[PDB]
Each structure stands twice: as structure tokens, then as C-alpha cells.
């Protein structure tokens, strides 16, 4: 109702589409999420790393920050 | 019963939607006003009075 998971998945496909020729950024993204999902880094670490993980395409990043709490 | 995509994407995403909200009550601990001490109680109290013929309403009055 606020964040929605279905929208997140749609975003996942969008990333796989653009970087279809470079599945590297994809694996690195999800991998990071799992590291945070388990025990390794924190929230600021995921946001920063991912931000640098998509260096070159401010589009995906712009839409990615939308998910995170604004303010 | 319901099989989805790879488990890898399911986990990473789970954390994604959980992180975007894991900063207040969903995961993090802050503001006990919304919902912190009451995650999913059983909802039950001693028979008080007029409030339904379920199992709580004094005794007869």
C-alpha cells in the first residue's frame, strides 16, 4: 500500500533489461542485498555500494532511491 | 505450494522491501506509539461487560 513488493520486482526486471548485456551489475546488486539480509553490512552500506554499483546510469539509481524512505 | 523465481532474487528483494521500511517499527525499533509492544497479541480479556457475547462481558449484567 506504501512500498509494495510487486513494484520492486518490476524494477528488478527493468535493471535486468537495461544491463542485459552486463549481468555483472545484477549479480553484484542481489549479492549485496543478501550480505545485508544475513550479516555483513548495514543500510547505509547497501545504499552507498549500490549507488556506486550503478555508476553510469543515474536512471536506475533515481528510481531506486524512491523505494527507500524519503526525507 | 507456490513456486516463484530463483531463491537468490527472492532473498535480495525481501531485504530490499524490508530495508525501505526497516527503520521504524517493521524491523528497526523506534516509536512505541504505532506498534512495538503489540506485534500480534491473542486479543483477550476477563469478562468486563457489554462488548459482545463472544467470551467477555461480566457475567450477566
PDB file of C-alpha atoms in Angstrom:
ATOM      1  CA  UNK A   1       0.000   0.000   0.000  1.00  0.00           C
ATOM      2  CA  UNK A   2       3.028   2.243   0.532  1.00  0.00           C
ATOM      3  CA  UNK A   3       6.128   0.467  -0.773  1.00  0.00           C
ATOM      4  CA  UNK A   4       4.692  -2.668  -2.405  1.00  0.00           C
ATOM      5  CA  UNK A   5       6.920  -5.622  -3.290  1.00  0.00           C
ATOM      6  CA  UNK A   6       5.448  -6.227  -6.750  1.00  0.00           C
ATOM      7  CA  UNK A   7       6.752  -2.817  -7.824  1.00  0.00           C
ATOM      8  CA  UNK A   8      10.203  -3.760  -6.571  1.00  0.00           C
ATOM      9  CA  UNK A   9      10.223  -6.896  -8.709  1.00  0.00           C
ATOM     10  CA  UNK A  10       9.148  -4.867 -11.734  1.00  0.00           C
ATOM     11  CA  UNK A  11      12.171  -2.688 -11.027  1.00  0.00           C
ATOM     12  CA  UNK A  12      14.330  -5.814 -10.880  1.00  0.00           C
ATOM     13  CA  UNK A  13      13.259  -6.785 -14.391  1.00  0.00           C
ATOM     14  CA  UNK A  14      13.920  -3.235 -15.570  1.00  0.00           C
ATOM     15  CA  UNK A  15      17.506  -3.492 -14.321  1.00  0.00           C
ATOM     16  CA  UNK A  16      17.975  -6.889 -15.963  1.00  0.00           C
ATOM     17  CA  UNK A  17      16.674  -5.333 -19.178  1.00  0.00           C
ATOM     18  CA  UNK A  18      18.992  -2.325 -19.359  1.00  0.00           C
ATOM     19  CA  UNK A  19      22.047  -4.247 -18.146  1.00  0.00           C
ATOM     20  CA  UNK A  20      21.032  -7.239 -20.245  1.00  0.00           C
ATOM     21  CA  UNK A  21      24.476  -7.207 -21.849  1.00  0.00           C
ATOM     22  CA  UNK A  22      26.152  -6.842 -18.452  1.00  0.00           C
ATOM     23  CA  UNK A  23      24.755  -9.390 -15.933  1.00  0.00           C
ATOM     24  CA  UNK A  24      27.640  -8.413 -13.653  1.00  0.00           C
ATOM     25  CA  UNK A  25      25.988  -5.402 -12.006  1.00  0.00           C
ATOM     26  CA  UNK A  26      22.923  -7.582 -11.419  1.00  0.00           C
ATOM     27  CA  UNK A  27      24.707 -10.373  -9.544  1.00  0.00           C
ATOM     28  CA  UNK A  28      26.627  -7.795  -7.501  1.00  0.00           C
ATOM     29  CA  UNK A  29      23.415  -5.984  -6.559  1.00  0.00           C
ATOM     30  CA  UNK A  30      21.471  -9.015  -5.320  1.00  0.00           C
ATOM     31  CA  UNK A  31      24.624 -10.429  -3.719  1.00  0.00           C
ATOM     32  CA  UNK A  32      24.976  -7.259  -1.668  1.00  0.00           C
ATOM     33  CA  UNK A  33      21.340  -7.433  -0.597  1.00  0.00           C
ATOM     34  CA  UNK A  34      21.934 -10.967   0.692  1.00  0.00           C
ATOM     35  CA  UNK A  35      25.019  -9.864   2.632  1.00  0.00           C
ATOM     36  CA  UNK A  36      22.837  -7.289   4.377  1.00  0.00           C
ATOM     37  CA  UNK A  37      19.970  -9.766   4.576  1.00  0.00           C
ATOM     38  CA  UNK A  38      22.248 -12.117   6.511  1.00  0.00           C
ATOM     39  CA  UNK A  39      25.017 -10.310   8.408  1.00  0.00           C
ATOM     40  CA  UNK A  40      27.762  -8.133   6.915  1.00  0.00           C
ATOM     41  CA  UNK A  41      26.875  -4.526   6.094  1.00  0.00           C
ATOM     42  CA  UNK A  42      24.236  -2.014   7.196  1.00  0.00           C
ATOM     43  CA  UNK A  43      21.579   0.103   5.476  1.00  0.00           C
ATOM     44  CA  UNK A  44      23.992   2.986   4.585  1.00  0.00           C
ATOM     45  CA  UNK A  45      26.354   0.377   3.186  1.00  0.00           C
ATOM     46  CA  UNK A  46      23.759  -1.045   0.810  1.00  0.00           C
ATOM     47  CA  UNK A  47      22.668   2.390  -0.405  1.00  0.00           C
ATOM     48  CA  UNK A  48      26.241   3.586  -0.971  1.00  0.00           C
ATOM     49  CA  UNK A  49      27.587   0.392  -2.555  1.00  0.00           C
ATOM     50  CA  UNK A  50      24.576   0.063  -4.862  1.00  0.00           C
ATOM     51  CA  UNK A  51      24.843   3.745  -5.783  1.00  0.00           C
ATOM     52  CA  UNK A  52      28.421   3.109  -6.911  1.00  0.00           C
ATOM     53  CA  UNK A  53      27.433  -0.272  -8.357  1.00  0.00           C
ATOM     54  CA  UNK A  54      25.269   1.502 -10.939  1.00  0.00           C
ATOM     55  CA  UNK A  55      27.844   4.173 -11.782  1.00  0.00           C
ATOM     56  CA  UNK A  56      26.912   5.390 -15.253  1.00  0.00           C
ATOM     57  CA  UNK A  57      23.128   5.064 -15.241  1.00  0.00           C
ATOM     58  CA  UNK A  58      21.505   7.735 -12.990  1.00  0.00           C
ATOM     59  CA  UNK A  59      18.120   6.437 -14.152  1.00  0.00           C
ATOM     60  CA  UNK A  60      18.022   3.185 -12.178  1.00  0.00           C
ATOM     61  CA  UNK A  61      19.558   4.973  -9.196  1.00  0.00           C
ATOM     62  CA  UNK A  62      16.974   7.768  -9.331  1.00  0.00           C
ATOM     63  CA  UNK A  63      14.170   5.222  -9.266  1.00  0.00           C
ATOM     64  CA  UNK A  64      15.964   3.115  -6.661  1.00  0.00           C
ATOM     65  CA  UNK A  65      16.107   5.870  -4.032  1.00  0.00           C
ATOM     66  CA  UNK A  66      12.330   6.153  -4.400  1.00  0.00           C
ATOM     67  CA  UNK A  67      11.913   2.853  -2.556  1.00  0.00           C
ATOM     68  CA  UNK A  68      13.992   3.958   0.432  1.00  0.00           C
ATOM     69  CA  UNK A  69      12.292   6.269   2.997  1.00  0.00           C
ATOM     70  CA  UNK A  70      12.498   9.911   1.775  1.00  0.00           C
ATOM     71  CA  UNK A  71      13.107  12.998   3.891  1.00  0.00           C
TER      72      UNK A  71
ATOM     73  CA  UNK B   1       2.726 -24.725  -2.814  1.00  0.00           C
ATOM     74  CA  UNK B   2       3.520 -21.516  -4.695  1.00  0.00           C
ATOM     75  CA  UNK B   3       6.851 -21.630  -6.531  1.00  0.00           C
ATOM     76  CA  UNK B   4       8.386 -18.313  -7.580  1.00  0.00           C
ATOM     77  CA  UNK B   5      11.596 -17.229  -9.315  1.00  0.00           C
ATOM     78  CA  UNK B   6      15.098 -18.106  -8.095  1.00  0.00           C
ATOM     79  CA  UNK B   7      15.680 -18.005  -4.336  1.00  0.00           C
ATOM     80  CA  UNK B   8      18.533 -15.540  -4.828  1.00  0.00           C
ATOM     81  CA  UNK B   9      16.296 -12.778  -6.192  1.00  0.00           C
ATOM     82  CA  UNK B  10      13.623 -13.605  -3.618  1.00  0.00           C
ATOM     83  CA  UNK B  11      16.082 -13.057  -0.766  1.00  0.00           C
ATOM     84  CA  UNK B  12      17.746  -9.899  -2.088  1.00  0.00           C
ATOM     85  CA  UNK B  13      14.348  -8.395  -2.872  1.00  0.00           C
ATOM     86  CA  UNK B  14      12.930  -9.427   0.501  1.00  0.00           C
ATOM     87  CA  UNK B  15      15.660  -7.396   2.148  1.00  0.00           C
ATOM     88  CA  UNK B  16      15.029  -4.546  -0.288  1.00  0.00           C
ATOM     89  CA  UNK B  17      11.374  -4.099   0.675  1.00  0.00           C
ATOM     90  CA  UNK B  18      12.316  -4.851   4.285  1.00  0.00           C
ATOM     91  CA  UNK B  19      15.088  -2.244   4.342  1.00  0.00           C
ATOM     92  CA  UNK B  20      12.960   0.519   2.823  1.00  0.00           C
ATOM     93  CA  UNK B  21      10.719   0.050   5.866  1.00  0.00           C
ATOM     94  CA  UNK B  22      13.179  -1.388   8.367  1.00  0.00           C
ATOM     95  CA  UNK B  23      13.843   1.942  10.057  1.00  0.00           C
ATOM     96  CA  UNK B  24      10.839   2.391  12.354  1.00  0.00           C
ATOM     97  CA  UNK B  25       8.609  -0.466  13.543  1.00  0.00           C
ATOM     98  CA  UNK B  26       8.767  -3.217  10.802  1.00  0.00           C
ATOM     99  CA  UNK B  27      12.355  -4.169  11.643  1.00  0.00           C
ATOM    100  CA  UNK B  28      14.050  -1.310  13.497  1.00  0.00           C
ATOM    101  CA  UNK B  29      12.990  -0.238  16.991  1.00  0.00           C
ATOM    102  CA  UNK B  30      11.558   3.270  17.329  1.00  0.00           C
ATOM    103  CA  UNK B  31       8.334   4.969  18.436  1.00  0.00           C
ATOM    104  CA  UNK B  32       6.320   2.632  20.662  1.00  0.00           C
ATOM    105  CA  UNK B  33       3.195   4.594  19.741  1.00  0.00           C
ATOM    106  CA  UNK B  34       2.356   2.891  16.375  1.00  0.00           C
ATOM    107  CA  UNK B  35       3.101  -0.785  17.033  1.00  0.00           C
ATOM    108  CA  UNK B  36       6.082  -2.082  19.005  1.00  0.00           C
ATOM    109  CA  UNK B  37       4.774  -3.740  22.167  1.00  0.00           C
ATOM    110  CA  UNK B  38       1.858  -5.287  20.269  1.00  0.00           C
ATOM    111  CA  UNK B  39       3.124  -7.291  17.238  1.00  0.00           C
ATOM    112  CA  UNK B  40       0.281  -9.818  17.149  1.00  0.00           C
ATOM    113  CA  UNK B  41      -1.396 -10.392  20.562  1.00  0.00           C
ATOM    114  CA  UNK B  42      -4.102 -13.000  21.129  1.00  0.00           C
ATOM    115  CA  UNK B  43      -6.643 -10.299  21.965  1.00  0.00           C
ATOM    116  CA  UNK B  44      -8.353 -11.490  25.142  1.00  0.00           C
ATOM    117  CA  UNK B  45      -9.526 -10.066  28.463  1.00  0.00           C
ATOM    118  CA  UNK B  46     -11.563 -11.035  31.522  1.00  0.00           C
ATOM    119  CA  UNK B  47     -15.341 -10.746  31.113  1.00  0.00           C
ATOM    120  CA  UNK B  48     -15.930  -7.000  31.732  1.00  0.00           C
ATOM    121  CA  UNK B  49     -19.344  -6.039  30.375  1.00  0.00           C
ATOM    122  CA  UNK B  50     -21.411  -5.162  27.255  1.00  0.00           C
ATOM    123  CA  UNK B  51     -18.931  -5.757  24.430  1.00  0.00           C
ATOM    124  CA  UNK B  52     -20.168  -8.860  22.639  1.00  0.00           C
ATOM    125  CA  UNK B  53     -21.411 -12.339  23.524  1.00  0.00           C
ATOM    126  CA  UNK B  54     -18.059 -13.779  22.441  1.00  0.00           C
ATOM    127  CA  UNK B  55     -16.419 -14.602  25.778  1.00  0.00           C
ATOM    128  CA  UNK B  56     -16.068 -11.278  27.597  1.00  0.00           C
ATOM    129  CA  UNK B  57     -18.975  -9.474  29.276  1.00  0.00           C
ATOM    130  CA  UNK B  58     -19.069  -9.527  33.072  1.00  0.00           C
ATOM    131  CA  UNK B  59     -21.371 -12.441  33.863  1.00  0.00           C
ATOM    132  CA  UNK B  60     -24.993 -11.442  33.253  1.00  0.00           C
ATOM    133  CA  UNK B  61     -25.146  -7.666  33.699  1.00  0.00           C
TER     134      UNK B  61
END
